[PDB]
Amino acid sequence: AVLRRRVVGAILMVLLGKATTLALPFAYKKAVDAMTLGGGAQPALTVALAFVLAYALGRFSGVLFDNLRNIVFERVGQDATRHLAENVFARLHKLSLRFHLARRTGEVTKVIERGTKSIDTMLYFLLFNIAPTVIELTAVIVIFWLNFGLGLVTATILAVIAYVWTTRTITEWRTHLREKMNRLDGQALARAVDSLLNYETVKYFGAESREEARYASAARAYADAAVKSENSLGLLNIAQALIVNLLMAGAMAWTVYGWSQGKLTVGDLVFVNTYLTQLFRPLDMLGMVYRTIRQGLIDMAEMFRLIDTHIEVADVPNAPALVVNRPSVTFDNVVFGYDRDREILHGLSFEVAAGSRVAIVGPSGAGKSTIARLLFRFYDPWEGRILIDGQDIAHVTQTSLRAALGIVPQDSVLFNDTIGYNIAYGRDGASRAEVDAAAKGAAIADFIARLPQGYDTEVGERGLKLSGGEKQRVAIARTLVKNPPILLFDEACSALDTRTEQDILSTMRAVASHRTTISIAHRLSTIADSDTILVLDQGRLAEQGSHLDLLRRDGLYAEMWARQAAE
Amino acid sequence: VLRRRVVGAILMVLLGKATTLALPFAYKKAVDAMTLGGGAQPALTVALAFVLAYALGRFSGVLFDNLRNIVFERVGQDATRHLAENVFARLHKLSLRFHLARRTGEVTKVIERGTKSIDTMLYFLLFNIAPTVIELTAVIVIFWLNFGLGLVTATILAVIAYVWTTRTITEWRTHLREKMNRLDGQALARAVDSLLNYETVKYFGAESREEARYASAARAYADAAVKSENSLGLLNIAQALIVNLLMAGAMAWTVYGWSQGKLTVGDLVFVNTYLTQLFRPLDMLGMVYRTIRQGLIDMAEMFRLIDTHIEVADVPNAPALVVNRPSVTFDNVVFGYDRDREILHGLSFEVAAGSRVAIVGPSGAGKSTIARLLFRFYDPWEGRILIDGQDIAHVTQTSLRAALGIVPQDSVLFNDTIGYNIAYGRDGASRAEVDAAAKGAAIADFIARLPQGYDTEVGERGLKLSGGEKQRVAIARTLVKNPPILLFDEACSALDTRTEQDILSTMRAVASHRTTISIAHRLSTIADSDTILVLDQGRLAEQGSHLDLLRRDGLYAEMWARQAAE
Ligand SMILES: Nc1ncnc2c1ncn2[C@@H]1O[C@H](COP(=O)(O)OP(=O)(O)OP(=O)(O)O)[C@@H](O)[C@H]1O
Numbered sequence A: 001a002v003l004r005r006r007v008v009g010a011i012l013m014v015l016l017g018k019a020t021t022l023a024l025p026f027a028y029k030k031a032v033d034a035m036t037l038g039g040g041a042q043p044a045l046t047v048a049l050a051f052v053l054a055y056a057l058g059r060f061s062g063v064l065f066d067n068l069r070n071i072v073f074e075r076v077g078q079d080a081t082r083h084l085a086e087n088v089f090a091r092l093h094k095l096s097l098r099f100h101l102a103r104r105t106g107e108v109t110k111v112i113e114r115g116t117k118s119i120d121t122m123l124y125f126l127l128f129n130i131a132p133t134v135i136e137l138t139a140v141i142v143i144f145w146l147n148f149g150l151g152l153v154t155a156t157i158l159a160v161i162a163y164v165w166t167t168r169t170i171t172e173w174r175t176h177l178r179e180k181m182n183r184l185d186g187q188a189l190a191r192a193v194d195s196l197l198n199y200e201t202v203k204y205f206g207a208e209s210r211e212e213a214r215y216a217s218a219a220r221a222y223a224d225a226a227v228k229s230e231n232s233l234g235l236l237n238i239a240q241a242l243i244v245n246l247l248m249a250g251a252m253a254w255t256v257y258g259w260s261q262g263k264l265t266v267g268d269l270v271f272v273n274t275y276l277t278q279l280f281r282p283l284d285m286l287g288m289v290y291r292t293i294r295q296g297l298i299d300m301a302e303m304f305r306l307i308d309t310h311i312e313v314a315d316v317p318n319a320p321a322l323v324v325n326r327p328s329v330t331f332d333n334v335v336f337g338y339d340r341d342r343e344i345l346h347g348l349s350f351e352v353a354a355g356s357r358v359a360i361v362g363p364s365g366a367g368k369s370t371i372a373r374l375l376f377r378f379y380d381p382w383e384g385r386i387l388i389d390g391q392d393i394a395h396v397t398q399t400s401l402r403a404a405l406g407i408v409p410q411d412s413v414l415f416n417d418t419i420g421y422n423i424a425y426g427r428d429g430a431s432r433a434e435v436d437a438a439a440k441g442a443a444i445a446d447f448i449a450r451l452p453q454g455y456d457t458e459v460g461e462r463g464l465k466l467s468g469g470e471k472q473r474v475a476i477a478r479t480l481v482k483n484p485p486i487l488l489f490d491e492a493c494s495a496l497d498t499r500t501e502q503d504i505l506s507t508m509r510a511v512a513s514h515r516t517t518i519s520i521a522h523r524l525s526t527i528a529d530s531d532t533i534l535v536l537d538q539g540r541l542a543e544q545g546s547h548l549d550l551l552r553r554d555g556l557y558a559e560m561w562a563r564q565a566a567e
Numbered sequence B: 001v002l003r004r005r006v007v008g009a010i011l012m013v014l015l016g017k018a019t020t021l022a023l024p025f026a027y028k029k030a031v032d033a034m035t036l037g038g039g040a041q042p043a044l045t046v047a048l049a050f051v052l053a054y055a056l057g058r059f060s061g062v063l064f065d066n067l068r069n070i071v072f073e074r075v076g077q078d079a080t081r082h083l084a085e086n087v088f089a090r091l092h093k094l095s096l097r098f099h100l101a102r103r104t105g106e107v108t109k110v111i112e113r114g115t116k117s118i119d120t121m122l123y124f125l126l127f128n129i130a131p132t133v134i135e136l137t138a139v140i141v142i143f144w145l146n147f148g149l150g151l152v153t154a155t156i157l158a159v160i161a162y163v164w165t166t167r168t169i170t171e172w173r174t175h176l177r178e179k180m181n182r183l184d185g186q187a188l189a190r191a192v193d194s195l196l197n198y199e200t201v202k203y204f205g206a207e208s209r210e211e212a213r214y215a216s217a218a219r220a221y222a223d224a225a226v227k228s229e230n231s232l233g234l235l236n237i238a239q240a241l242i243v244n245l246l247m248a249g250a251m252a253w254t255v256y257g258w259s260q261g262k263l264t265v266g267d268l269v270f271v272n273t274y275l276t277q278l279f280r281p282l283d284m285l286g287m288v289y290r291t292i293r294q295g296l297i298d299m300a301e302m303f304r305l306i307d308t309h310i311e312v313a314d315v316p317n318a319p320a321l322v323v324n325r326p327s328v329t330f331d332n333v334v335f336g337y338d339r340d341r342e343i344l345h346g347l348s349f350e351v352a353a354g355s356r357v358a359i360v361g362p363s364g365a366g367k368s369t370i371a372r373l374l375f376r377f378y379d380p381w382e383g384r385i386l387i388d389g390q391d392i393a394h395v396t397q398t399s400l401r402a403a404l405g406i407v408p409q410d411s412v413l414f415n416d417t418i419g420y421n422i423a424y425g426r427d428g429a430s431r432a433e434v435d436a437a438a439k440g441a442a443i444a445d446f447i448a449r450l451p452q453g454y455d456t457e458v459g460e461r462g463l464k465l466s467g468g469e470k471q472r473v474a475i476a477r478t479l480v481k482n483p484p485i486l487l488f489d490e491a492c493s494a495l496d497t498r499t500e501q502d503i504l505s506t507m508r509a510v511a512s513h514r515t516t517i518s519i520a521h522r523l524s525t526i527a528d529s530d531t532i533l534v535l536d537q538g539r540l541a542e543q544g545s546h547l548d549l550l551r552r553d554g555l556y557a558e559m560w561a562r563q564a565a566e
C-alpha cells in the first residue's frame, strides 16, 4: 500500500489511547502508597499537582487521541468509501436489462445507501472496537489472575458468557424486527419515488390526496416497525446494563468483604473500583459491536446478493471480436419470450443483406422492438440464433457487437445537460465538425441556430424541455455521430412532421451508401421506398418483399396501406 | 393524545436528575460516617450504602436513559411521519417548471438530510434545553448560597470563552459543511442521471466515461468531507481543552481551599462530584449546538427550495368551473417558456362544444404547448383562455383539472399492474368501468390473452409493455376519468392504423356530448375531424374541414400532399 504509514499511525494512536486508562490507576496507587498524611509539608503540593495532572491531562489526551485518530483516518476512510461507491456504480451498470426494466427505484436506493453507510461504519468499528476492548479485558483478567482473586476471574468469565448469550438471543430478536423495518422503509421510499416520477400523471388525474394517503400508510407502518425495533434495542441495553452493574456490585461487595474499613492490599480497593468505572464501557460496547456487526453483515449480504445476480448476457470465455466487412443481419428460427409463460416471438427467420434498406412493419405489439432488443443482445433467444456478417451474436464479445451497430430507440432518454453534450455523446471526444454534420443531417442546425445560447440550452430531465420532434432529432444526431455500419431506427419519426422526415431521409440517401439500415414504423408513407419490407404479426414473418410486390399480393401490408390511404 | 407520554418522559428525566443529585448526597453521608465513629451496625450500614448507592445509581441511570428512549420513540416516529407527509405534500404542490428542470439526486439528498436531521434536532432539544437550565441554575444557586463568589465568576467566564470559541469555529465550519453537502448532492445527481440513461449508455457503450465522471464527483465529495471532519475535530479538541481546563481549575480551587483537609466537609466533595457529573453535559452541549446549527441551516435550505413561490396559484376564493357547453377559446394568447424565447405569440381560435378538432402544423409550432397552457401548467404572458365563456385563471385548479382529460405525448405509468393504472382514472374506479375502458381502448382481448393479465407487472414507467399497449393504457385511464373535454397529444403515434381506426370507431359510436381535441402529424388520423387548425409560428393560419382546407390550396393542402406522396 501507499498509505500503510497512515494506518500504522492510526494503530499507534489507538495504542496511545491505552495511556489514559494506564494513568488513571496511577493516581490512586500513588495516593494509597502513602498510608496517612503522605508528604505533609513539601509533597502535599506534589500530590495535588499529581491529581490535577492525572485527571485533566488523561481526559484531554483521551479526547485528543480520539479526534486525532479520526482526523488522520478520515482520508483513508473516505478513499475507501469512494472506491466502494465507484465499484458499486460499475457493477450496477453491468446488470441486465430485465432488472433495470422491472426495478423499483426507491427500494434499490435504500438498499444501496444502507449498504454503503453500514459497510463504512463496519470498517471503522472493526479496528476501533475489536482490538482495544480485547486488549483491555485481557489485561484486566491477567491483573485479577496474578492477584489472590481466583473466584473473580471465574465469575467474570461466566458472567461474560451469560452476557454474550443474552446479547446473541436479543440480537436475533432485534434482527427479526429489523427485517420488517427495512422492508417497510424500502416500500415507503419506493412508493414515494414512484409517486414523484408520475408527477404529470398525478396532476392530469388530480390524485394528490390519494398519493399522500398511500405514502402516509407506508410511513406509519414503517414508524410502527421502527418503534418496535428501538424498544427491542432498549431491552437489550437494559439487560446488558443489568449484567454489567451486577458484576460491578459483586466486585465491590467482594472488595468490601476483604476488609470493611481498610484495604486488602495497597491498590486493591481503589484499583478495582476505578477499573470498574473504566470497564462498564467495554462490556456495554461489546454487545453494541456484536449488534452492529450482525446487522452490517446481513445488509451487505443482501446488497451483494442483489447486485451479483448472474447477468443474463455474459461473454463466452475467449470470445472473438465482431468483424464487420459485409454487414448483414440474419434470424435463424429465433424463438424468444421475455417470460416463460408468454411466448413473444415464435419461429422467425429472415435475412437482411449488406447495404439494404429494410423495413419491419406490423400490428401493435407484434414484437418488432423485440427484434431490436434481441439484435443488441439484451436477451439471449430460447432457440435459433442471430447472425451479423455470418457470425453468431452470442458467441462474440458484447463490446464489439454493441459498438458495431447504432440503434435509435422508440422512447429516447437524454442527459440533463446541453443539447451539445447529448449530441456529442454519440462518440467520445467528438469534434465540432462531426456534431455540426449530425445536426444538419438530423434537421436541428436551423433549430439550434435560432435558439438563444442554442448549443448550451438545457434539455431538462430525460430531455423533456425539448419537443418530441426535437428530442427524436437529437437522438438521430447522437446515432449519426456514432457512425455505425448498421443504423437501426425504432419509431424515430413518430413525433416529427412529414417535412423534417423527408429532409432527413433525403440526407441519408444522399450520403449513407455503405450502411445497412433497418427501420420499423407504422406510418407507411416513410418506408414504401425501402428495398424489402417484413410484415411481422403475432411474432411471425407473414409477408416479405418490395413495397410494390406487397401491395400487389393483396395481403396484410396491402390492407394496411389501403387503410392508411383512406380519408 | 400522546402529551401524557412526553410528560412521563420529562418525569423520567427528572428521576435521572434525582439519581445524579443523590450520588453526592450518598457520598456526603459516607463522609459523615467517615468522621463519625461507627461500629458493627454503622460499618455494615455504610458498606451496604456504598454498594447500593453505586450499583443501583448507575443501573437506574442507564435504565432511565433507556426508558426515556422507549417512551420517546413513539412520539419521535410520529413526528417524523408527520414531517415526511407534509414534505411529500408540499413537494407535489410545486409547479411544472420545477419538476421539468429539476435534478433528482440533489433534491433527494436535501430532502433526506432535512428529514433525518429534524428528528435528532427535536431529540437533542428536549434532552438539552431543559436539563441544562435545571443543572446550571441548581449549581449556580448552590455555589452562591453555600460556596464563594469567585467560583461562579470563573465558571461564567469559562462558559463565555467556550461559547465564543464554538461561535468562531462554527462560523469557520459553515463554509465546509455547505461545500460538502453541495458536492455530495452533485455527485448523487450525476449518478442518478447516469442510471436513468442506462439504455443510452448501453447503446453507445460509454460505461467507462460515466464511471470516470462519477469517480471525479466522488473524489471531490471525499475531499470536502475530509476537510469538514478535520474542522469538526478541531472544534472538538478546542471544546475538550476548555472543558478540561475548567475542570482542572475547579479541582485546583478546591485543593487551594485546604490541601490536607476541607474548608467544609461537603465543599470539596460536592465540587469534585459535580465535576464528575458535569463532564458529560459539557461535552454533550457543544455537539448538540453544532448539530442544531447544521440541522437548522439544512432545514432552512430545504424549505427555501420547497417554498419557492409556486408559479400557478388560484385567485383568492375563486368559483368552480361550471361546464354546460364545453368549448375552448384562445384570445390573443402570447406565451413563452423562457423570457428570452417567445414560443407562442398572438394565437386565437375557437373549439365549440361536441366538435372533434385537430391541431396540425410543423414540428415545434407549439401544439403540446397549447396542451400545457390549457391545463394551467403555466400562466400565459398576454391574452386569455376560456372554457364555456369562463376564464381559466379565475377558477379553482381542482375543478379545471378534473374537467379535462389529457393523453400526453409521453405517457408515464406507475410501477404496478395494468389494472391499477387503468383504475387510476377516477378514485375507487369500479372494475366495470375498468373493463369498459379496456374495451374502449382495444385491450380487453389483449389483457384476456395475457397470463395473469390484469395483474401483469408493467415495470417502472410501463416499459415492460409495448408502445401501442402503453398508449392504449393511457387512453383507458383517460376514459375512466370521463371528462367533458378529451385532449389527445400524439396518442396513436405508436399504434397501427387498424387499432387507431377501431378505437376511433368505438369512441364516435359511444361519445356523443364529448368535446374532443386531437394533435397529430399523421394526417390519416385526423382527416375525418370536424375542423382542423393549422398552427404556424404560434398562430392560427387555417381552420376548417379537411375537404375545405384541401380545396383552399393552403398550408394544410401542402402537408397532406406531402404525406400522401410515396
Ligand atoms: N419545458 C420547456 N422548456 C423550454 N422549452 C420548451 C419546453 N417545452 C416546450 N418548449 C419549446 O416550445 C416549443 C413548442 O414545442 P412543442 O412542445 O409544442 O412541440 P410540438 O410542436 O408539440 O411537437 P413537434 O415539434 O413534434 O410537432 C418548442 O420549440 C420547444 O423547444
Ligand SMILES: Nc1ncnc2c1ncn2[C@@H]1O[C@H](COP(=O)(O)OP(=O)(O)OP(=O)(O)O)[C@@H](O)[C@H]1O
Residues within 6 Å of the ligand: A098, A101, A338, A339, A344, A362, A363, A364, A365, A366, A367, A368, A369, A370, A371, A410, B463, B464, B465, B466, B467, B468, B469, B494, B495, B496
Ligand atoms: N419486460 C417485458 N416483460 C414481458 N413482456 C414484454 C417485456 N418487454 C416487451 N414485452 C412484450 O413484447 C411485446 C411488445 O413488443 P413490440 O416490439 O411488439 O412492441 P411495439 O411493436 O413497439 O408495439 P406497438 O407497435 O404497439 O408500438 C408486448 O407483447 C409485450 O408484452
